[PDB]
Amino acid sequence: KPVTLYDVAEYAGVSYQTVSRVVNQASHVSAKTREKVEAAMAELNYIPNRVAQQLAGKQLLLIGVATSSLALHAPSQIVAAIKSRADQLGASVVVSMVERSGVEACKAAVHNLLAQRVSGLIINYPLDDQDAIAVEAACTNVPALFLDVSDQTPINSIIFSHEDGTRLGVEHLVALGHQQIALLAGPLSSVSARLRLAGWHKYLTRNQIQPIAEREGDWSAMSGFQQTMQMLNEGIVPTAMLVANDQMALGAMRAITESGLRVGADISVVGYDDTEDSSCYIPPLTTIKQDFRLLGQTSVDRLLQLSQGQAVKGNQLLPVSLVKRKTTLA
Amino acid sequence: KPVTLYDVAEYAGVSYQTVSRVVNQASHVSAKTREKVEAAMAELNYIPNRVAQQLAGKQLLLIGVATSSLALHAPSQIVAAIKSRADQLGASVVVSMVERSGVEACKAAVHNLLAQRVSGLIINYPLDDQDAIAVEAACTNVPALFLDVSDQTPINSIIFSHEDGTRLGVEHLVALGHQQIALLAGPLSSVSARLRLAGWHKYLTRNQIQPIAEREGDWSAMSGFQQTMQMLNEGIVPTAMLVANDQMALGAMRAITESGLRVGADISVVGYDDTEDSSCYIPPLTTIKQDFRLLGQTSVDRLLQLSQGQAVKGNQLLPVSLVKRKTT
DNA sequence: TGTGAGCGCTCACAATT
DNA sequence: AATTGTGAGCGCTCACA
Ligand SMILES: O=[N+]([O-])c1ccccc1O[C@@H]1O[C@H](CO)[C@H](O)[C@H](O)[C@H]1O
Ligand SMILES: O=[N+]([O-])c1ccccc1O[C@@H]1O[C@H](CO)[C@H](O)[C@H](O)[C@H]1O
């Protein structure tokens, strides 16, 4: 037994709609009849049923999110900012976390987000061009925002400019004098992983450079260590490395270190993300800064824009920037 | 206007209650008329309004979570597993984040988590005893399970055994022949931080040892850094630290190293958490394994047991380990 | 395999002063 | 021209021609 709108009606000697009228801060209640209702809602701890209100047709803002596992670093900070900017403007956010692999798994997360009748979907799951389109199709009537697709994918999306990110990493190493460079890509299953790899290649090629090695991790610090050992042990030893995130950069550094040479001097490392923890690596990691707050922030503002039918369609690139630290010098 | 049950009624040639049995799979395998309704709903892509299902009274188990900012390590990881184990059981979960400081914030979080009509909530927010009680109260008719309160707090709680963690660490550093030990604790605002500090004090005393330094971090590596630097610049130079988490430990190590001394041999370190990244710190960091996935899994099971009446009231401690690494 | 309830609200607005 | 009370029904599930 929870407390109905009707209950406040009997205790306060008014109708139900006049409680609704007050709960909804609506015009026309004489201000002295308000006290009767305002006092009655206390003395009953009345919290109005939002399930009842949604159905009734209250225009609340409800943003759905289909997200990669919150255990990973970046999808987590994004949800947090998404969540934060919701409250900031009176929106609520239900988030279905895609855990299993592939297009069908993500579609179900879109399916039961649609169940709860969301005003629009933020899709932070990695989707290839066609599957992205497949999913955006499934968002029937509701606008959908994509955060882990390519800029070439012909839907709406926010991505950090991986072009800029890699340009900075490449043009740095290159200006520094490096030529034997190795690449440590993210897991190829991720779009963003692939884009950064692509990017490095473009700007290396534009500088007449070919990476001596190129291998793949899973974002994890351990992989980046394993991968930079599998490399160094084969005897391929670059003067610099481009890593696809700070955690794997960490791994590489460890491997580079345990291998008997010094980070920066003997092998420079450029990370990717600029995490909290990256300013306290040994030595403190040079990286490409991605403002996940800003992403989740805009990610919301846009979905709500799109929800209202504002002309803000397609792709937009967020800025990145190079954090110069101690892993590239002398 | 989206697809209604009243719209599958005069397209498949039946009623509303017939489509209701199809998606529910409740009692009868209603002939070859199922085939007709299957192809009917899938043609217009009908998705049963879960808001209408709920108001109606569908016995779907919906958990609420009031949680510290997911940007921090431990909380994210926990919801990560809370969201997972509930999914494993066919429970959905709505999380509500506390950013603002204090009790009134968490009270409000609980308030708008009740509107969504959860059938019990997991409170992963740091709460002093009387506030924890006041929060549990506001959870009208619904069971609360607290995750960032003390063992002594008289509500439902799962916490990791801070007693064991802090034993493990102290009892280990000491067996390595250490007497000049320092402490780096969590931001004192967090209960679990204080539980850890306390367990350290407890066991360091049981071993006739006074800590030569006590400094307060904020979970961040930067704080763990400058917090160890501002102590080493004072002149205090232990041979071991006990640190509240792997992350501040990280900054400690930076600080120790950048100063001019070998992490491990000159000043050993013990972190707390066993984060994925901890195994690749330079050198790999000794720490206390705190199985976040476990905690989030068990939380969800308990709130469930709690919701149905299965009487397992009170407090529950979870095991920890010492991953013996290379900073000792 | 159908019909007539009611869940807690918000919207029309018609009814009270 | 101030107010408030009263009539739908939003979508679905529950118990029984
Ligand atoms: O993959 N992304 O959609 C994405 C969006 C914003 C910033 C980075 C990028 O996320 C990437 O995520 C992976 C795990 O999913 C790792 O956390 C990696 O460190 C991060 O850069
Ligand atoms: O504070 N906790 O509720 C808690 C539960 C399980 C394990 C550790 C402990 O979490 C602690 O949380 C803080 C930030 O929330 C840091 O992430 C720290 O590393 C973690 O140990």
Tab-separated table of C-alpha atoms in Angstrom, chain B residues 86-280:
chain	number	residue	atom	x	y	z
B	86	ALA	CA	20.377	-8.186	-12.199
B	87	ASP	CA	20.325	-8.719	-15.986
B	88	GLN	CA	21.377	-12.303	-15.371
B	89	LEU	CA	18.227	-12.688	-13.251
B	90	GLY	CA	15.855	-10.683	-15.442
B	91	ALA	CA	15.736	-7.737	-13.082
B	92	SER	CA	16.147	-4.271	-14.531
B	93	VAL	CA	17.989	-1.576	-12.550
B	94	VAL	CA	17.668	2.174	-12.367
B	95	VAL	CA	20.668	4.002	-10.866
B	96	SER	CA	20.568	7.494	-9.355
B	97	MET	CA	23.857	9.343	-8.816
B	98	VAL	CA	24.811	11.554	-5.858
B	99	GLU	CA	27.070	14.450	-6.760
B	100	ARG	CA	26.283	17.024	-4.046
B	101	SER	CA	27.784	16.382	-0.590
B	102	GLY	CA	25.935	15.351	2.583
B	103	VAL	CA	22.863	13.385	3.672
B	104	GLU	CA	20.266	15.685	2.166
B	105	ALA	CA	21.688	14.829	-1.266
B	106	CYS	CA	21.289	11.082	-0.742
B	107	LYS	CA	17.854	11.619	0.779
B	108	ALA	CA	16.812	13.360	-2.486
B	109	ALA	CA	18.412	10.585	-4.552
B	110	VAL	CA	16.317	8.094	-2.593
B	111	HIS	CA	13.249	10.332	-3.105
B	112	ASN	CA	13.314	10.358	-6.939
B	113	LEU	CA	14.287	6.678	-6.913
B	114	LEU	CA	11.015	5.952	-5.119
B	115	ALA	CA	8.953	7.748	-7.753
B	116	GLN	CA	10.203	5.175	-10.299
B	117	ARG	CA	8.797	2.701	-7.722
B	118	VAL	CA	11.782	0.416	-7.211
B	119	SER	CA	11.175	-2.692	-5.059
B	120	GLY	CA	14.186	-1.990	-2.784
B	121	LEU	CA	17.410	-0.003	-3.282
B	122	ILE	CA	21.157	-0.487	-3.012
B	123	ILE	CA	22.767	2.526	-1.365
B	124	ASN	CA	26.404	2.840	-2.351
B	125	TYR	CA	27.043	6.267	-0.787
B	126	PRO	CA	29.208	7.033	2.272
B	127	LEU	CA	26.940	7.547	5.303
B	128	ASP	CA	27.560	8.046	9.042
B	129	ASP	CA	25.360	5.788	11.268
B	130	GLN	CA	22.503	8.171	12.122
B	131	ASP	CA	22.295	9.312	8.518
B	132	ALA	CA	22.289	5.719	7.328
B	133	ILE	CA	19.315	5.126	9.682
B	134	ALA	CA	17.532	8.215	8.405
B	135	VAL	CA	18.067	7.043	4.834
B	136	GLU	CA	16.763	3.511	5.535
B	137	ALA	CA	13.693	5.161	7.094
B	138	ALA	CA	12.869	7.267	3.995
B	139	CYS	CA	12.790	4.025	1.945
B	140	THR	CA	9.072	3.591	2.583
B	141	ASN	CA	7.975	-0.098	2.630
B	142	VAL	CA	11.078	-1.032	0.578
B	143	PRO	CA	14.241	-2.808	1.758
B	144	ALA	CA	17.506	-0.879	1.713
B	145	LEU	CA	20.939	-2.520	1.446
B	146	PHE	CA	23.818	-0.215	2.318
B	147	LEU	CA	27.285	-0.547	0.844
B	148	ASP	CA	29.324	2.366	2.210
B	149	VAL	CA	28.497	2.273	5.936
B	150	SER	CA	30.325	0.653	8.858
B	151	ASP	CA	29.925	-2.911	10.170
B	152	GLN	CA	28.591	-1.455	13.435
B	153	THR	CA	25.884	0.565	11.679
B	154	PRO	CA	22.564	-1.176	12.516
B	155	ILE	CA	21.154	-1.508	8.981
B	156	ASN	CA	21.648	-3.920	6.070
B	157	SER	CA	25.180	-3.808	4.796
B	158	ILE	CA	27.666	-5.591	2.653
B	159	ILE	CA	31.166	-4.309	3.081
B	160	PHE	CA	34.529	-5.840	2.344
B	161	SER	CA	36.381	-7.059	5.424
B	162	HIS	CA	38.468	-3.970	6.155
B	163	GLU	CA	39.497	-5.785	9.260
B	164	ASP	CA	41.137	-8.494	7.098
B	165	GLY	CA	42.536	-6.115	4.489
B	166	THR	CA	44.300	-3.988	7.068
B	167	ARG	CA	45.459	-7.035	8.974
B	168	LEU	CA	46.871	-8.647	5.797
B	169	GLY	CA	48.859	-5.510	4.956
B	170	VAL	CA	50.239	-4.641	8.398
B	171	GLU	CA	50.837	-8.270	9.343
B	172	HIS	CA	52.803	-8.630	6.088
B	173	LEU	CA	54.934	-5.458	5.991
B	174	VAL	CA	55.925	-6.354	9.558
B	175	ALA	CA	56.977	-9.899	8.674
B	176	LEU	CA	59.282	-8.225	6.153
B	177	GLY	CA	60.997	-6.478	9.077
B	178	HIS	CA	59.444	-3.009	8.995
B	179	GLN	CA	59.078	-0.512	11.874
B	180	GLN	CA	59.291	2.910	10.251
B	181	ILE	CA	55.874	2.736	8.522
B	182	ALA	CA	53.716	5.592	7.144
B	183	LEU	CA	49.968	5.734	6.351
B	184	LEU	CA	48.018	7.204	3.485
B	185	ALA	CA	44.276	7.027	4.046
B	186	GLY	CA	41.243	7.844	1.908
B	187	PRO	CA	39.492	11.186	2.126
B	188	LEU	CA	38.221	11.078	5.666
B	189	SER	CA	34.687	11.858	4.434
B	190	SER	CA	34.345	8.284	3.113
B	191	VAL	CA	33.373	5.639	5.658
B	192	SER	CA	35.331	2.860	3.929
B	193	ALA	CA	38.340	5.164	4.085
B	194	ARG	CA	37.943	5.473	7.884
B	195	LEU	CA	37.348	1.775	8.277
B	196	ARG	CA	40.649	1.176	6.537
B	197	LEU	CA	42.536	3.793	8.545
B	198	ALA	CA	41.060	2.295	11.710
B	199	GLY	CA	42.033	-1.280	10.834
B	200	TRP	CA	45.566	-0.075	10.204
B	201	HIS	CA	45.788	1.634	13.581
B	202	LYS	CA	44.283	-1.437	15.239
B	203	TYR	CA	46.809	-3.895	13.834
B	204	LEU	CA	49.876	-1.633	13.891
B	205	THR	CA	49.255	-1.246	17.627
B	206	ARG	CA	48.736	-5.026	18.082
B	207	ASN	CA	52.305	-5.224	16.741
B	208	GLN	CA	53.772	-2.567	19.072
B	209	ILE	CA	54.287	-0.032	16.253
B	210	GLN	CA	53.594	3.692	16.023
B	211	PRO	CA	53.164	5.137	12.492
B	212	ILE	CA	55.731	7.884	11.789
B	213	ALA	CA	53.308	9.677	9.450
B	214	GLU	CA	49.604	9.941	8.711
B	215	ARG	CA	48.426	11.942	5.686
B	216	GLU	CA	45.012	12.195	4.027
B	217	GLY	CA	44.433	11.497	0.323
B	218	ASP	CA	41.395	11.848	-1.927
B	219	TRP	CA	41.599	8.528	-3.819
B	220	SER	CA	43.308	10.397	-6.699
B	221	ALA	CA	46.874	9.531	-7.724
B	222	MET	CA	47.820	13.182	-7.739
B	223	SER	CA	46.896	13.517	-4.078
B	224	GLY	CA	48.723	10.297	-3.224
B	225	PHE	CA	51.622	11.927	-5.054
B	226	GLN	CA	51.869	15.372	-3.478
B	227	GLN	CA	50.739	13.889	-0.160
B	228	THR	CA	53.823	11.655	-0.120
B	229	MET	CA	55.999	14.472	-1.447
B	230	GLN	CA	54.919	16.958	1.250
B	231	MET	CA	55.850	14.325	3.853
B	232	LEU	CA	59.244	13.392	2.332
B	233	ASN	CA	60.096	17.101	2.077
B	234	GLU	CA	59.373	17.439	5.799
B	235	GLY	CA	61.992	14.813	6.584
B	236	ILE	CA	59.879	11.787	7.458
B	237	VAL	CA	61.114	8.814	5.398
B	238	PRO	CA	59.497	5.474	6.290
B	239	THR	CA	60.502	2.124	4.915
B	240	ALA	CA	56.913	1.153	4.145
B	241	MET	CA	53.639	2.869	3.370
B	242	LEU	CA	50.128	1.520	3.765
B	243	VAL	CA	47.937	3.308	1.239
B	244	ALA	CA	44.119	3.488	0.983
B	245	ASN	CA	43.921	2.437	-2.682
B	246	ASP	CA	46.073	1.462	-5.679
B	247	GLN	CA	45.610	4.868	-7.258
B	248	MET	CA	47.074	7.006	-4.477
B	249	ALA	CA	49.666	4.258	-4.096
B	250	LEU	CA	50.556	5.016	-7.704
B	251	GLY	CA	51.268	8.673	-6.888
B	252	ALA	CA	53.148	7.571	-3.791
B	253	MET	CA	55.438	5.456	-6.004
B	254	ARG	CA	55.902	8.405	-8.397
B	255	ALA	CA	56.762	10.567	-5.362
B	256	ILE	CA	59.082	7.944	-3.889
B	257	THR	CA	60.814	7.464	-7.288
B	258	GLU	CA	60.990	11.105	-8.368
B	259	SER	CA	62.535	11.923	-4.983
B	260	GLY	CA	65.520	9.643	-5.494
B	261	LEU	CA	64.712	6.250	-3.986
B	262	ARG	CA	63.796	2.709	-5.084
B	263	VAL	CA	60.150	1.754	-4.612
B	264	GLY	CA	60.156	-1.575	-2.774
B	265	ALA	CA	63.727	-1.856	-1.478
B	266	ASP	CA	64.112	1.687	-0.079
B	267	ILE	CA	60.431	2.344	0.740
B	268	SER	CA	57.989	-0.526	0.248
B	269	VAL	CA	54.309	0.100	-0.641
B	270	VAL	CA	50.951	-1.705	-0.189
B	271	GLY	CA	47.880	-0.490	-2.099
B	272	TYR	CA	44.220	-1.426	-1.666
B	273	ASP	CA	41.825	-2.607	-4.459
B	274	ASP	CA	43.867	-4.701	-6.931
B	275	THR	CA	42.819	-2.630	-9.901
B	276	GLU	CA	43.488	-4.068	-13.337
B	277	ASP	CA	46.193	-1.402	-13.857
B	278	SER	CA	47.917	-2.254	-10.568
B	279	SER	CA	49.585	-5.308	-12.085
B	280	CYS	CA	51.521	-3.080	-14.508
